[PDB]
Write a protein that binds this ligand. Sequence first.
Ligand SMILES: NC(=O)C1=CN([C@@H]2O[C@H](COP(=O)(O)OP(=O)(O)OC[C@H]3O[C@@H](n4cnc5c(N)ncnc54)[C@H](O)[C@@H]3O)[C@@H](O)[C@H]2O)C=CC1
Ligand SMILES: Cc1cc2nc3c(=O)[nH]c(=O)nc-3n(C[C@H](O)[C@H](O)[C@H](O)COP(=O)(O)O)c2cc1C
Ligand code: SF4
Ligand code: FES
Lengths: 217, 62, 433
Amino acid sequence: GAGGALFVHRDTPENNPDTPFDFTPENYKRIEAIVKNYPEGHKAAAVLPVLDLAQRQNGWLPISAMNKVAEILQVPPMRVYEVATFYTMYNRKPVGKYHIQVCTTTPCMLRNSDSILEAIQKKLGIKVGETTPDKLFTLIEVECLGACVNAPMVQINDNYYEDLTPKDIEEIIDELKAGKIPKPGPRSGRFSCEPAGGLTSLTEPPKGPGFGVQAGL
Amino acid sequence: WSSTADPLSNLVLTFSTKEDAVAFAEKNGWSFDVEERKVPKPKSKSYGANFSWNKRTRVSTK
Amino acid sequence: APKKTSFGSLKDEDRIFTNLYGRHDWRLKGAQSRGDWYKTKEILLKGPDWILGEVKTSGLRGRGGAGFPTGLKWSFMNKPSDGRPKYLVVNADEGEPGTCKDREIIRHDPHKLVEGCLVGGRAMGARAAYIYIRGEFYNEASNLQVAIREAYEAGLIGKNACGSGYDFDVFVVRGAGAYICGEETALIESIEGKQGKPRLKPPFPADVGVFGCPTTVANVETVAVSPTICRRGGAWFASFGRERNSGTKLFNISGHVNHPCTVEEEMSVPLKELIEKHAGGVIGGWDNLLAVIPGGSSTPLIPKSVCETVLMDFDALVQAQTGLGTAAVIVMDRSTDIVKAIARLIEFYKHESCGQCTPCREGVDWMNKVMARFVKGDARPAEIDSLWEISKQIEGHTICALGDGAAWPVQGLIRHFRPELEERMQQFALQHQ
Ligand SMILES: NC(=O)C1=CN([C@@H]2O[C@H](COP(=O)(O)OP(=O)(O)OC[C@H]3O[C@@H](n4cnc5c(N)ncnc54)[C@H](O)[C@@H]3O)[C@@H](O)[C@H]2O)C=CC1
Ligand SMILES: Cc1cc2nc3c(=O)[nH]c(=O)nc-3n(C[C@H](O)[C@H](O)[C@H](O)COP(=O)(O)O)c2cc1C
Ligand code: SF4
Ligand code: FES
């Protein structure tokens, strides 16, 4: 439906050009490595990875971070604003310690993803746009995560938790807020995109290097 | 309101060519000034120039 | 008995992605155990023309979803150099709902993709390869980087790749959550630090591409099969499938099936056989089948009456008015609100439009509103024909093919389930006076 996030920036005491932001020296070395991956006349190509690195170091992207990236890469700030607003993995607002994203697309939706959404909502007490008052959990709806075979699937802090049932996501939230790291992947004894039972293919051992190499080679 | 005293303040004529207008003005006894027609010169447009490898024509945004 | 007429059962020895389920080490050692990176030097020293000829005679068609003949496309970039460098861009965005094949290829045997990048670059005379992986695939991209590091240390790529005397680099670039960035020109724009907005053609990427240099955008599945095709030859690959539908394919079966999975099968396998063999059959029996989307959200849905004999290739599915696309099967049983699923797909396309061109930017949102009203039933039956005309206007008038992928699902829904929409509007009218 509606987006809910505005694409106009208004200065705030918590988000203004004079908000403190700066890369760490290690991040500066990483930026150098990122920039050295492109032809010498095209350094604007590094806008996306450097912006992502700024987000990874800071957690989100204040306007000061965008201005810093624009200054580092000698790119006009409007281009960095364009990139930051176009791509949905960029957080122009603070988020929780764990960003819970649940796919609501048709393949995921067919296999009861509403159960996962309601389980998360009931366990955390927040809706699909809000944040936990502890400021450690955030819940949103995403499109398709490319893991349709395992459904419903939830991605948290760049990790995939698949083959979910309400109990599975509930215990995932419990052990995440308990300071533990839940095992990413499915939770049905499947651990891949294989059939749930039988292994209907690739049962014979794979063969060696020169199995069917043609002649004259 | 806006008042006028000259009767020709609204008169505008239309002609196919400059020569016809000149002939009309001359036969009616009016002195005239002629301005030669201005045409936009043809331009060389290239959509691929937007993404040039070494030129300054490359565009930062679309 | 030449010219096979019944396909759909190939055994493990004829499969390319032998580590599809990640049961063997993906570290270089497993790839070498499985025959990966074998005799790559001899293939590289055969020249680009030989590789292009093998790819042409193999009849391989683009696995991205368009089915463009790969040999001609890769030979488009076979011109003498004019000073600008040449690049190969491997597409790994994988934004189509229902598709998971590229994820498994990248995570479970990335050395196949690396060697495909090498052989494709040699064939296309490309200086380096850029792999644009989906930003959400962080672990997959990290595994790809580990494989790339192993290849660099082993001398398989970089300066003097193998012993061919050929210099080639591979770079991995991550996106940030944009489905439109899977389109080749939008992907190129995203690599160059701009918004993921497609550019018009002509020019084609073979003439003015990434950084304004000649480049070719190819799906990761298309790239990852070229080394084995070179090793086993064009003919071995061209034997499978029908004529002009050669080779094998990865299939994703999701939705209302007992055991959703991803398998490798010969191309022209019938849909029913694939569903009841690899996916364990439709949930509740084959008689509980309502509709199947054969190739992802952009392909029109077909009713159960067509899934009894239809084959899984480009030509047969085109004759069925539904297309093959990415071979992502979404199964919907008789308990499925068929209007709700199509409305959700249209909402996805409304959230994924880049906004550049008028028909997509406005008409996809218009269709989304109309379909949201259709789900409840507020509309009148004339609005069905109105929606058909709106989809017709959008299709073929947009910069890229996302307008097509938005218009086609509603066209299929109106084609095959018009009585459902009509009766839903009737029920709403009789309920709300
Ligand atoms: N893999 C995935 O997850 C997704 C796949 N798709 C599929 O993408 C399909 C449409 O893709 P398009 O690229 O827009 O179709 P297209 O036919 O315009 O292009 C297909 C390939 O053929 C090349 N090509 C076509 N005509 C050419 C020419 N005259 N000269 C040189 N090269 C030429 C193009 O450069 C391109 O690489 C859709 O049918 C969809 O199924 C869509 C979304 C996601
Ligand atoms: C909106 C849109 C999204 C696309 N997303 C992808 C994608 O994620 N992965 C992919 O391989 N192709 C995608 N494509 C199709 C690309 O054009 C395709 O990758 C490219 O033509 C490569 O050609 P090939 O199929 O011969 O490899 C997309 C096309 C469109 C219109
Ligand atoms: S069709 Fe949609 S996604 Fe494609 S260029 Fe036009 S507005 Fe952008
Ligand atoms: S529909 Fe959920 S990952 Fe694609």
